[PDB]
Swiss-Prot record:
Gene3D superfamilies: 1.25.10.70. Present with 11700 molecules/cell in log phase SD medium. Component of the nuclear pore complex (NPC). NPC constitutes the exclusive means of nucleocytoplasmic transport. NPCs allow the passive diffusion of ions and small molecules and the active, nuclear transport receptor-mediated bidirectional transport of macromolecules such as proteins, RNAs, ribonucleoparticles (RNPs), and ribosomal subunits across the nuclear envelope. Due to its 8-fold rotational symmetry, all subunits are present with 8 copies or multiples thereof. Interacts with POM152 and NIC96. One of its GO terms (molecular function) is structural constituent of nuclear pore. GO terms for cellular component: nuclear envelope; nuclear membrane; nuclear pore; nuclear pore inner ring. It is a peripheral membrane protein. The modification Phosphoserine is found at residue 313. This is Nucleoporin NUP188. Belongs to the Nup188 family. It is found in: Nucleus, Nuclear pore complex; Nucleus membrane. Keywords: Coiled coil, Isopeptide bond, Membrane, mRNA transport, Nuclear pore complex, Nucleus, Phosphoprotein, Protein transport, Translocation, Transport, Ubl conjugation.
Length: 1581
């Protein structure tokens, strides 16, 4: 059936597409909109709804069984409950997503806009219904007691989850309702319903749940503190909703009087009566029914409403009672607490800011009010802050403060508090103060002349604000200063003040006041007044805002200069006077006295001071005692152990972690070279030590605020990952250049530990990974409350993946304990994978599993199937199958699943792979047979289904699908279920044919064009690999691939895939050069990426852009290049794509070569002319020096091999081809073999790279086997053939034999190393000298050579020198023993016979006298000694005997009477062996074989031939022939005697005797040959 979409998946998709709607796939977007248009009423209306355990939980859910079929038949009831919660939350997620961004579906959005207030009323009714059944029925259901205890625990846990989910549901509905009713005119019906159900149901519920004074484990503060945390948010949101319904508007920053509430005279009465009833019955309960904000704002609403009308009647009877109530209930601190609780969303900050701006008119600005305003308003958006600061009422109230400014509590403290709103506003109000107000008890001390206009006739000394009494510092007012005297009460609804106009700076005054406060801080001690202490903290915070990096370094420096003008010069610890030193002294004193607020504020100051002033922070951290110094515990640990571990607040720890993050990032920069490396290294090491100390213990602390625990783990996992990533994934050829290398090494040592280790860092990481299975983590970590937990989790997943990758890249590192922990906790990750509420954690889990499986284990291998089990593995398979087959699917999830399948197929996890492929466990291996795959529960079915959607599927997903298919095909299975339906092969062929976008490839490609080319290459490589496998496994079943390969125009399509021309060496070399003059301290290769794994194959080429951004963040040339300057960012981005392009081009060339090779191997029919054209193309490509740049010289080798085998395949078939192409190929192969990248002449290549010229040698040998090419181009043919012949033969033979001389004696002063055993397998003489050279010699001699060719050959041989090296190698054979026998002489005779076969060479060599020279050798004398028999060395002895007889016979036959004396002396010297053989044959007891018959026939042929061409002992006299004939008559009559005398001494003789014996052939050959020769002799005589 159809899987059908669910609300959770649609909500996840809309969350993904909430940023950019156009960025998502258009078809998926259209299908999502089609789903939305069908479900328009089910979003909200379906929420409304007006065997004992299942009935109890069904009553708990307040929904019928048949209403939820998924809940009905779910085996695990917890899964059904989780699914129902997820669907209920996802409906409102969809509604909120539509409200926030209407562009997702404008048709469904309009369904809400036209029915806005009906939806609002429905939301209020739903909130009331949820509150009604929150505890009335759930508590009764929990109170039930049937039997068992595990069921009771499960029911209790489910009830607690349901209650917390109900609270989260209320929070969600409140968020949506506040979004809807904002800046809208609320009808009086909604107002009445809200003001009725708020008093009737909401406040009592909140108070009852807050105080529960009206199963033991997992019910402590881990549970009770949760409800108190949620109820506070719920009450704050009720307060905000009540404020919004009254008519607050953020567009005008004022209450909307024209709302229907105030135009109705009856609904106004109900609200007024409700507030009056709340006021009049307050004292019974100290907490009012309505928040003091509501009464406090109603006071102003009533005042404005009365002022709009004419009559007022009573004034204080009704207007002022609400104000008095609010003031007596401490409205300001309640407002501050309300602002603090609602900090998660920025809208409520705007609401409170506009409320404060509205209330400005009725509030005089004082110390407490200014403090509250600074605390609240400073977090508002910039536009609302500007609106508040530009208000006319605020300006008028600020002018009064600024009038009489230097009065401490009156004006100075409120102005300092107001300065904490905006930095530019503070600068404007503090830079140019132009008023000085002085109060004096006695007027005699002032010499002023005279109604308020006075003048000063002398200089005046006035003590500055908060000046020490003993200090001599005073402020001087010059004479002739106009003054104004004020002695009357302030005119708003004071002492004798005198105000002079005096232009002075306020920053200097504030700095002097701060120094004075420091002096009293270290004099009195810790008993400083709160007013002074808070003034000090406020001044420190103001300077912190001043020194913020958001300010320009110039103006920050100017302000800090202003702040230090009036400081005392008595201090001399550091030259000059600075406010930074004052704040540092305050920090040290506060650290000594354990003052939490002061240290927190100073740590914030020092955290924000780092980016622009690092030479001060580093110096302080060196001098201060906050960090450990040589075995001495620092002040930070003293505070953490005593103060923070008892109070439960860890603001200082989080501030320290933030400082660590900022310090590391600023130290990695390039503008901080003026700071020494050693200080930075020491400080970074100390900070990393502190961070590691914090990491191993924070998880067991007690937290008053739960979010703080998320704020710590977020900062810890963010520091480790950056340090490890910047070091272990960059700079392949170095390991310690970066300043953070030591910290990275120590972190790697701590995280990766051997098996026996028990270190707590891997345990903490693993505990973080499996957190979502906790109840408190499920509740607090939900996305409704916030997204900090999700960031924590993705950081942890990234860190764990990076650690596994780093370990896997080193063979020396043994398997770590973290991987064993992950293997043990592997069934706890499948649980997270299958959780309905966690669908944004699937890709990361799958990637982690793939990385874990890919890791190599040497000693012992852990099996995933053994850890998961039989039940947990099947659930994983079901979830994976459900994910694979969905109507709408995520591309990232599909890609990750394909990568996971590919990785699992390569690994040794055979059980899991078998389960995934076949759907059944590997334990039942007997089931494996034909049709033994469960089609319903196998990945193969889904692979087949998705393989046909190549056009719709994106190219990455399809290419990885093809990788998985190839891995399935090549090794795991032989039955090709894929090719049963030809649709797959047809789709592959269509993609290959229409993939012709590879035409231009050069015409100034853009970035997107290059990316598309890369993807196309990646797809085509996999396609041709699949085709190669399909054609190889089956010869003729895939007739369509054969037809595609047999087409006429294949060559034009495939010829460009074998050429690699997409690399720009000049571009890649000028970029590296130009990077070292702009920034000479850096080299571009330092930022090169390191490939750690194939799972991250896409991001493995080029340079790291984030690291370059970190290093060069402060450089203008990197960030804002000019028009006349190069753009290094874009060039580096381009250079990273070229490497990937070249890599995939080479891969595609390799795959195409493999496919063509495997096609040519099997084909038997004659090939087309397209392959001749392809061979010509390959040879020309090698002509143009395809390896001069050393561009992956295996392309050269594969081209050579392809050309050789295509040429060789023409021998098996006919292939009648013209001689012109033969000549072209022959000339091109000569030009390849001479000079160029090949190293045959230099003799260096032959010893090492013998594969670069041996295919060429066989190609030359077998290409000449075609029709003889010696007629048409006989001139060029002869010239090229002679050149190639001499160049190969003379040089190779001379060099090989010179090397042999080197191993036997001193050839070129290299040294003498004569020995029986040397080098390996005759170097190349075994193959390169006798397999090819003599064969090509014979081919030329069989090619009808001309006399002029022989003459030129002889001339070249004389120029080189011949047969001297032959005698030298014969002496080598004398001095070299192989298998305890001299075997190198078997080829000397062959070479001699080949040389002597032709007349000119033989005639030229005989003049040098080969006979005596070869006879003088000791082996020749040993052979001449006689008594040589085949019993000793049959094969070799017959070989040399036949060789010498053949050469003697041929020379005698060819040459005339000028050689007869030489032959006569040769046979006289060699006659002893012949006589011994004759005597042995006459005496019998000798093994005679076919070789002996051949030797006897050759001797007989030489005899009478040395006679008639006018000696031979044993054959000259006729008596010898008579005796031989008598012996012949004796033995020829007894074949059985000959068979008995025959002894098989040769393998061929043994084989012949085994098969029907050999006596018949032996006797027949002997009889025929001997009778013929005897008849010839008798006729001649």
């Amino acid at each position: 059936s159809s899987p059908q979409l669910t609300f959770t998946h649609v909500a996840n998709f809309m969350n993904d597409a909430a940023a950019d709607v156009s960025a998502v796939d258009a078809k998926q977007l259209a299908q999502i909109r089609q789903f939305l248009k069908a479900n328009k009423t089910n979003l909200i209306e379906s929420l409304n709804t007006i065997n004992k355990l299942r009935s109890t939980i069904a009553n708990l859910l307040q929904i019928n069984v048949d209403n939820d079929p998924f809940f009905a038949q779910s085996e695990d009831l917890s899964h059904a409950v989780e699914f129902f919660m997820s669907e209920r939350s996802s409906r409102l997620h969809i509604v909120y997503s539509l409200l926030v961004n209407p562009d997702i579906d404008l048709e469904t959005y309009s369904f809400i806009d036209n029915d806005r207030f009906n939806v609002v009323g429905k939301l209020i009714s739903i909130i009331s219904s949820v509150i009604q059944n929150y505890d009335i029925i759930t508590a009764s259901s929990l109170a039930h007691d049937y039997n068992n205890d595990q069921d009771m625990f499960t029911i209790v846990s489910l009830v607690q989850l349901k209650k917390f989910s109900d609270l989260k549901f209320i929070l969600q509905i409140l968020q949506i309702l506040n979004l809807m009713i904002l800046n809208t005119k609320v009808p009086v019906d909604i107002v009445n319903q809200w003001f009725l159900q708020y008093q009737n149901q909401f406040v009592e519920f909140c108070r009852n749940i807050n105080s529960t004074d009206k199963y033991k484990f997992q019910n402590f503060q881990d549970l009770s503190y949760l409800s108190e945390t949620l109820i506070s948010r719920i009450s704050s949101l009720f307060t905000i909703t009540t404020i919004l319904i009254l008519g607050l508007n953020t567009s005008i920053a004022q209450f909307d009087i024209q709302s229907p509430l105030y135009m109705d005279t009856e609904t106004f009465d109900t609200v007024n009566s409700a507030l009056e009833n709340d006021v009049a019955t307050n004292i019974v309960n100290e907490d009012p029914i309505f928040h003091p904000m509501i009464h406090y704002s109603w006071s102003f609403i009533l005042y404005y409403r009365r002022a709009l009308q004419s009559s007022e009647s009573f004034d204080d009877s009704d207007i002022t009672k609400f104000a008095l109530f609010a003031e007596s209930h401490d409205v300001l601190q309640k407002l501050n607490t309300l602002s603090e609780i609602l900090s998660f969303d920025p809208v409520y900050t705007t609401v409170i800011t506009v409320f404060l701006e509205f209330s400005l008119n009725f509030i005089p600005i004082t110390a407490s009010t200014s403090r509250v305003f600074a605390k609240i308003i400073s977090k508002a958006p910039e536009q609302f802050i500007e609106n508040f600061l530009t208000n006319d009422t605020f300006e008028k109230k600020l002018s009064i403060i600024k009038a009489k400014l230097p009065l401490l509590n009156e004006s100075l403290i409120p102005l300092i508090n107001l300065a904490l709103i905006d930095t530019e506003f503070a600068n404007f109000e503090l830079k140019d103060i132009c008023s000085f107000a002085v109060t004096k008890s006695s007027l005699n001390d002032l010499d002023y002349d005279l109604p308020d206009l006075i003048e000063l006739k002398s200089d005046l000394l006035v003590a500055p604000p908060l000046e020490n009494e003993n200090s001599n510092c005073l402020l001087s007012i010059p004479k002739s200063t106009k003054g104004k005297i004020l002695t009357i009460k302030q005119q708003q609804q004071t002492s004798n003040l005198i105000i002079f106009l005096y232009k002075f700076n306020g920053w200097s005054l504030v700095g002097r006041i701060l120094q004075n406060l420091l002096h009293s801080y270290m004099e009195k001690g810790t008993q400083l007044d709160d007013l002074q202490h808070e003034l000090m903290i406020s001044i420190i915070k103001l300077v912190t805002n001043v020194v913020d990096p958001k300010t320009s370094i110039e103006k920050s420096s100017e302000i800090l200069s202003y702040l230090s003008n009036s400081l005392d010069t008595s201090a001399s610890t550091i030259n000059g006077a600075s406010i930074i030193q004052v704040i540092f002294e305050i920090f040290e004193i506060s650290l000594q006295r354990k003052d939490y607020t002061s240290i927190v504020q100073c740590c914030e100051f020092m955290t924000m001071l780092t980016p622009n002033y690092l030479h001060l922070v580093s110096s302080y951290l060196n001098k201060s005692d906050l960090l450990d110094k040589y075995g001495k515990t620092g002040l930070s640990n003293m505070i953490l152990g005593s103060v923070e571990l008892s109070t439960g607040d860890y603001t200082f720890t989080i501030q320290l972690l933030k400082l660590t993050k900022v310090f590391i990032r600023e130290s990695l920069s390039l503008k901080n070279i003026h700071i020494s490396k050693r200080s930075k290294i020491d400080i970074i090491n100390k900070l990393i030590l502190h961070a590691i100390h914090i990491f191993e213990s924070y998880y067991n602390w007690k937290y008053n605020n739960f979010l703080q625990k998320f704020e710590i783990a977020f900062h810890l996992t963010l520091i480790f990952y950056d340090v490890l990533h910047d070091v272990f994934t960059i700079n392949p050829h170095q390991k310690d250049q970066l300043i953070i290398s030591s910290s990275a090494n120590k972190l790697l040592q701590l995280f990766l530990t051997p098996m026996d280790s028990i270190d707590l860092a891997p345990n903490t990481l693993t505990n973080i990974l499996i957190s979502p299975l906790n109840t408190t983590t499920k509740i607090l970590g939900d996305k409704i409350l916030g997204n900090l937990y999700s960031k924590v989790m993705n950081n942890s997943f990234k860190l764990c993946t990076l650690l596994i990758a780093i370990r896997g890249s080193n063979r020396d590192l043994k398997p770590s304990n973290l991987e064993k922990l992950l293997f043990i906790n592997s069934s706890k990750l499948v649980d997270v994978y299958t959780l309905p509420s966690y669908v944004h954690f699937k890709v990361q889990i799958i990637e982690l599993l793939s990385y874990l499986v890919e890791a190599p284990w040497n000693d012992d291998y852990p099996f995933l199937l053994s850890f998961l089990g039989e039940a947990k593995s099947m659930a994983f398979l079901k979830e994976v199958l459900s994910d694979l087959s969905s109507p709408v699917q995520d591309w990232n999830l599909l890609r990750s699943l394909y990568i996971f399948f590919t990785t699992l197929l390569e690994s040794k996890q055979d059980g899991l792979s078998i389960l995934f492929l076949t759907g059944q466990f590997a334990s039942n291996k007997k089931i494996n047979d034909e049709s033994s795959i469960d089609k319903k529960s196998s990945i193969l079915t889904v692979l087949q289904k998705n393989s046909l959607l190549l056009d719709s599927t994106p190219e990455e997903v399809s290419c990885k699908l093809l990788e998985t298919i190839t891995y399935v095909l090549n090794t795991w299975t032989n039955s090709k279920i894929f090719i049963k339906d030809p649709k797959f092969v047809n789709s592959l062929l269509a993609k290959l044919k229409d993939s012709k976008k590879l035409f231009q490839k050069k015409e100034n490609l853009t970035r997107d064009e290059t990316v598309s080319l890369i993807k196309k290459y990646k797809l085509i490589s996999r396609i041709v690999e699949i085709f190669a496998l399909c054609i190889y496994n089956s010869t003729d079943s895939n007739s369509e691939i054969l037809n595609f390969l047999n087409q006429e125009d294949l060559f034009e399509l495939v010829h460009h895939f074998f050429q690699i021309d997409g690399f720009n060496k000049t571009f890649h070399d000028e970029l590296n050069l130009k990077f070292k003059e702009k920034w000479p301290s850096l080299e571009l290769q330092s930022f090169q990426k390191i490939p750690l794994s194939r799972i991250n194959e896409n991001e493995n080429f080029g340079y790291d852009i984030p690291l370059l951004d970190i290093v060069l963040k402060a450089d203008r040339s990197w960030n804002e290049p000019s028009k006349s300057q190069t753009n290094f960012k874009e060039e580096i981005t381009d250079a990273s794509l070229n490497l990937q392009y070249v890599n995939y081009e080479i891969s595609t060339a390799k795959a195409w070569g493999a496919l063509i090779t495997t096609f040519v191997k099997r084909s038997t029919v004659p090939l087309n002319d397209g392959f001749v054209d392809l061979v010509e193309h390959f040879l020309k490509l090698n002509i143009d020096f395809g390896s001069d740049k050393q561009m992956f010289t295996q392309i050269y080798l594969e081209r050579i091999e392809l050309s050789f085998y295509i040429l060789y395949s023409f021998k098996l078939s006919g292939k009648l081809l013209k001689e012109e192409k033969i000549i072209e190929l022959m000339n091109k192969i000569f030009t390849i073999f001479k000079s160029g990248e090949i190293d045959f002449i230099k003799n260096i290549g032959k010893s090492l790279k013998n594969n670069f010229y041996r295919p060429l040698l066989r190609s030359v040998l077998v290409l000449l086997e075609l029709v003889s090419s010696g007629d048409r181009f006989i001139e060029l043919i002869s010239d090229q053939l002679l050149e190639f012949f001499e160049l190969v033969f003379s040089k190779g033979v001379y060099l090989i034999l010179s090397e042999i001389l080197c191993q036997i004696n001193k050839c070129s002063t290299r040294g003498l190393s004569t020995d029986h055993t040397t080098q390996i397998v005759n170097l190349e003489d075994n193959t390169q000298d006798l397999l090819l050279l003599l064969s090509l010699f014979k081919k030329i001699t069989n090619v009808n050579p001309s006399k002029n060719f022989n003459v030129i050959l002889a001339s070249s041989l004389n120029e080189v020198g011949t047969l001297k090296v032959i005698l030298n190698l014969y002496s080598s054979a004398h001095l070299i023993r192989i298998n305890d026998e001299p075997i190198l002489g078997q080829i000397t005779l062959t070479f001699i016979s080949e040389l002597c076969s032709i007349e000119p060479i033989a005639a030229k060599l005989i003049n040098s006298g080969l006979y005596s020279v070869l006879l003088e050798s000791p082996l020749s004398v040993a052979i001449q000694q006689g008594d040589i028999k085949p019993e000793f060395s049959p094969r070799l002895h017959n070989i040399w005997s036949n060789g010498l007889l053949s050469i003697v016979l041929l020379l005698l036959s060819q040459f005339g009477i000028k050689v007869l004396p030489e032959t006569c002396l040769f046979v006289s010297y060699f006659g002893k062996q012949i006589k011994s053989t004759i005597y042995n044959w006459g005496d019998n007891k000798l093994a005679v074989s076919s070789s002996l018959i051949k030797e006897t026939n050759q001797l007989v042929l030489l005899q009478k031939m040395l006679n008639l061409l006018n000696l031979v002992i044993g054959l000259d006299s006729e008596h010898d022939k008579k005796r031989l004939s008598a012996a012949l008559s004796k033995f020829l009559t007894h074949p059985k005697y000959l068979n008995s005398r025959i002894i098989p001494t040769t393998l061929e003789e043994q084989q012949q005797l085994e098969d029907e014996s050999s006596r018949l052939e032996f006797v027949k050959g002997i009889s025929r040959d001997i009778k013929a020769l005897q008849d010839s002799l008798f006729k001649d005589v």
